[PDB]
Amino acid sequence: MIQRTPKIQVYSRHPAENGKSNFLNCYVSGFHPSDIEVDLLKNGERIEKVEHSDLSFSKDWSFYLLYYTEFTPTEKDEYACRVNHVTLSQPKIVKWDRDM
Amino acid sequence: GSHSLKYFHTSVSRPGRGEPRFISVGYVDDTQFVRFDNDAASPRMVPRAPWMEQEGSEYWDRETRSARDTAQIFRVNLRTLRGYYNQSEAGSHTLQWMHGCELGPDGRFLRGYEQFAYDGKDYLTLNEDLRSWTAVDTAAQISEQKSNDASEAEHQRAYLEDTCVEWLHKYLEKGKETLLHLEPPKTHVTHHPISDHEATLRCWALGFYPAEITLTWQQDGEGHTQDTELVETRPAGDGTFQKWAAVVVPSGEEQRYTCHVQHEGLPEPVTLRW
Amino acid sequence: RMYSPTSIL
């Protein structure tokens, strides 16, 4: 059986501007199998009921998903994405960087 | 220009938890427009783009029947392949199927494809001649033998070259204002000094459609790149895409680096500097 | 329009 670890990007739909509404995105891609747990965090605590896109896959059969929720960037708030998968010996946390 | 209608079907067996999970998504170019998820009492094919609501009740009924039948067929396929490989009931396994058309600039059928994957690896593939198959191993040769017995390539050739091509034309018309409207990227360069000697230059491309784009940190020959990083094109979540390219440059050599951006929505390629 | 499968693997 085949295993591929997810590639993770945490970003926003629009360039972040403190106080203005936006969308926090976590894009997992290139992983296999499809079973994957993805959470969005506000200051280390899971954001309530985040949404995600429909399961699709690439030319090499690896899956990709977009997990997203509405959020408002703040200078003090630290957002992140927490990913759990078969290929990870422990959940991987990726900080949100407003210039990446 | 080139256009494609693609369906991506995924079936994952649940050991001890019931019948397999089945998910189907349809794409027109880089735009998802339909979805089917069998994890419901009465699962239905549902639109995933607003312009698909222009289709009547019978259309959705027909796709719902097609998708529910596919889900059952894939449940049989999972049991069949599990028997081919002498695999127990305790293992969860995945069968994937991608299917669809591609049009050339001339608007006619250009290339069709039908491919099967078992557990993330190639299994059975219809070749571009649309008459032969490629089996990855001994098991898939049995599936190829079944496909030849049933003239499966003949039925696929008629779907890929005709039924699929006709409906792609119908979808490009309904989603005309969004599918055929190119969104050029909005581009800007940011600057971050890693240290007193060096600095990062990051060229941004935001909100473009379709996903095909090229971001290049061109250089006048005398730049001494310390590091570089291109990120995979990622969905913005509103139908458009994002991408950036970065380069670590000696501070004082910023002007030797230009960012070249290519995209179908651009009347000319865009060059921009910090 | 998706394709209702014709044969079994």
Residue numbers in the entry:
A (entry chain B): 1 to 100
B (entry chain A): 1 to 274
C (entry chain P): 1 to 9
Copy the relevant paper text.
Diffraction data from multiple isomorphous HLA-E*01:03—RL9HIV peptide crystals were merged in Xia2 yielding a 100% complete dataset to 2.6 Å resolution. In contrast, the RL9HIV peptide carries canonical anchors Met at P2 and Leu at P9, yet adopts an alternative C-terminally shifted kinked motif in the binding groove, resulting in a distinct solvent exposed signature with implications for immunogenicity and peptide-specific TCR interaction. RL9HIV exhibits an alternative, C-terminally shifted, kinked motif, wherein P6 and P7 arch away from the base of the groove, disrupting C and E pocket occupancy. The P6 RL9HIV and VL9 Cα atoms are separated by 4.2 Å and the P7 Cα atoms by 3.4 Å (Fig. 2h (i)), disrupting the ability of the RL9HIV P6-Thr and P7-Ser side chains to occupy their respective C and E pockets (Fig. 2f (i) and (ii)), and concomitantly rendering this region of the peptide more solvent exposed (Fig. 2h (ii)). However, the extended conformation between P1 and 5 of the RL9HIV peptide, arising from C-terminally shifted backbone arching, positions the P5-Pro Cα atom only 1.8 Å from the VL9 P6-Thr Cα atom, with the two side chains deviating by as little as 1.2 Å, potentially permitting a degree of compensatory C pocket occupancy. Despite minimal Cα deviation facilitating optimal secondary anchor residue-pocket alignment, the P3-Tyr side chain is prohibitively large for shallow D pocket binding (Fig. 2f (iii)), instead projecting toward the α2 helix in the C-terminal direction of the peptide. An extensive, yet distinct, hydrogen-bonding network secures RL9HIV in the PBG. Thus, P6 and 7 are stabilised closer to the α2 helix in RL9HIV than in other HLA-E-peptide complex structures.
